[PDB]
Design a protein around this nucleic acid. Structure first.
Lengths: 33, 56, 195, 30, 198
RNA sequence: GGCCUCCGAACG
């Protein structure tokens, strides 16, 4: 009933789409600063 | 009626993992009436089926 | 709709080619968006250490998103008509509405590209020469979001610190275009995205 | 064969057990 | 007559229908009114302790049963409060079954709420049935209930101050006798709070 | 929220 359905739709969307779990863009995308 | 063309069971470990997903979307518990009138909803054994009468 | 899936399944299998085909359960196509503005600044650098890209993301207005779906002012129209549409519609400043670089993906998706900064107005050749590069890389990054790899909606981008190259051969398309999606991914991450 | 449950041959074994959902499945779902 | 026949059918379906978690569909299919709910819980516990050995199916039927509706878990709280009034009145062999069912439901903790407060009688006042059964349910419930997380999490759940015998600090006989009875029953470091407080 | 296979006569 809660946003867990949307976040689970993103995680399952990446798993079914062939993408890694990711969800952390700090180290991957952004600079360490 | 009967199982008709289906004999007993036909499946595969790699085919079930590719077609289905351990983690997938869950909204409704797969309504049979939805798959009845929609031959594209149920892809199991679509052979010799007279169906798809839309509304009224 | 599901009717096109039924006629496409019965047409494909029952009409075009007869073969065993197993289809998975249908699902809606997810989209990418931004709930809030990006507070953290985007720090990007070329692999050859030449050009540096910095930008921030902000959610577009409701009338700006719906107008973006309606296309609002024509992209081929002069910048004066765009400044009059954004200034007379979203109450944006003349310099802010006149700083728009490029539109969203395929001039369709609600993604704005504009550079408003004090040093940006000092060097015109920096933003002009760097326009086709960042926007050339931002078009590919706008189709696949940083999370679900979906088109970004209501995504506003404003470049702040743009380092222009010694020689232009130092930072090329490979040092610019892919780096534009990384800064957009960082700004989208700090922007608290929403599907 | 209903949705999720059924016996292809109803004459196969004994009689078709008119199953429902079990007053406990709702307890496990809630 | 109504409770005799209701207990005859409840015991007939209780001794039958293996994996009683599925038998809950028949128990709820009986459609007993609210007046037969409390008597069905008391007689349900009587059939739970009537077996020759401790049965986990009774704990599962009580967990799902009591976990079904609000008056169900409420009937488990009130029925557990009435069960705490047994003490020496309960059978010796059935005390292990009451400790196994009460320890199984206590491990889940869902339906019981104040059962932790109703336990822990005074220092020198006991029937030895709640002390021995409290040691059996404390050892088994300590093993399967995650005793470090059960005692550590139970310390912040305010269950100890709500219990008479579990109260440390002021009362010397409660904390001291609780340290001697707990440490003597195998609690080990679980009595260090009452030992240092005493 | 429902779905209830059952179903016998000789000869030998």
């Amino acid at each position: 009933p809660a946003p867990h359905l949307a976040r689970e739709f993103m995680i399952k969307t990446r798993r079914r789409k062939g993408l890694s779990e990711d969800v952390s863009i700090s180290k991957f995308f952004d600079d360490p600063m | 009626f009967e199982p008709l063309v289906r004999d007993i069971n036909l499946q595969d470990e790699d085919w079930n993992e590719f077609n289905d997903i351990n983690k997938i979307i869950i909204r409704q518990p797969i309504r049979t009436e939805y798959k009845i009138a929609f031959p594209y909803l149920y892809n199991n054994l679509p052979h010799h089926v007279h169906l798809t009468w839309y509304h009224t | 709709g599901e009717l096109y899936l039924d006629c496409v399944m019965h047409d494909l299998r029952k009409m075009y080619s007869e073969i065993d085909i197993k289809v998975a359960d249908p699902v809606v196509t997810f989209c990418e968006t931004v709930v809030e503005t990006s507070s953290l600044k985007c720090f990007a650098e070329t692999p050859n250490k030449k050009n540096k890209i910095t930008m921030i993301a902000e959610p577009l207005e409701k009338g700006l998103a719906e107008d973006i779906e309606n296309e609002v002012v024509q992209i081929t129209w002069n910048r004066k008509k765009l400044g009059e549409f954004f200034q007379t519609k979203y109450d944006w400043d003349l310099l802010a509405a006149r700083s728009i670089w490029a539109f969203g993906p395929d001039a369709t998706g609600p993604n704005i590209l504009v550079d408003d900064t004090l040093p940006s107005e000092v060097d015109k050749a920096l933003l002009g020469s760097v326009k086709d590069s960042i926007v050339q890389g931002f078009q590919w990054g706008t189709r696949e979001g940083p999370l679900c790899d979906e088109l970004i909606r209501n995504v506003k981008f404003k470049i702040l610190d743009a380092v222009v190259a010694q020689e232009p051969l130092h930072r090329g398309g490979g040092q610019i275009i892919p780096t534009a999606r990384r800064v957009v991914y960082s700004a989208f991450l700090m922007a608290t995205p929403r599907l | 064969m209903y949705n999720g449950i059924g016996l292809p041959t109803p004459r196969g074994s004994g009689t078709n057990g008119y199953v429902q959902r079990n007053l406990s499945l709702v307890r496990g779902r809630r | 007559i109504n409770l005799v026949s209701f207990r005859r059918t409840i015991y007939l379906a209780i001794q039958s229908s293996l994996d009683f978690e599925e038998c809950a569909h028949k128990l709820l299919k009986m459609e007993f009114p609210e007046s037969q709910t409390k008597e069905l819980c008391n007689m349900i516990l009587d059939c739970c302790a009537q077996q020759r050995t401790y049965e986990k199916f009774f704990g599962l039927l009580a967990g799902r049963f009591c976990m079904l509706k609000k008056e169900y878990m409420e009937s488990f709280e009130g029925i557990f409060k009435e069960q705490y009034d047994t003490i020496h009145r309960l059978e010796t062999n059935k005390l292990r079954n009451v400790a196994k069912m009460f320890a199984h439901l206590l491990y889940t903790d869902s339906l019981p709420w104040s059962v932790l407060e109703c336990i822990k009688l005074s220092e020198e006042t006991t029937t030895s049935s709640s002390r021995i059964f409290v040691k059996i349910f404390f050892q088994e419930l300590c093993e399967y209930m995650g005793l470090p997380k059960l005692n550590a999490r139970l310390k912040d759940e305010t269950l100890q101050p709500f219990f008479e015998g579990l109260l440390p600090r002021d009362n010397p006989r409660n904390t001291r006798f609780a340290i001697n009875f707990f440490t003597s029953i195998g609690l080990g470091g679980l009595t260090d709070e009452l030992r240092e407080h005493l």
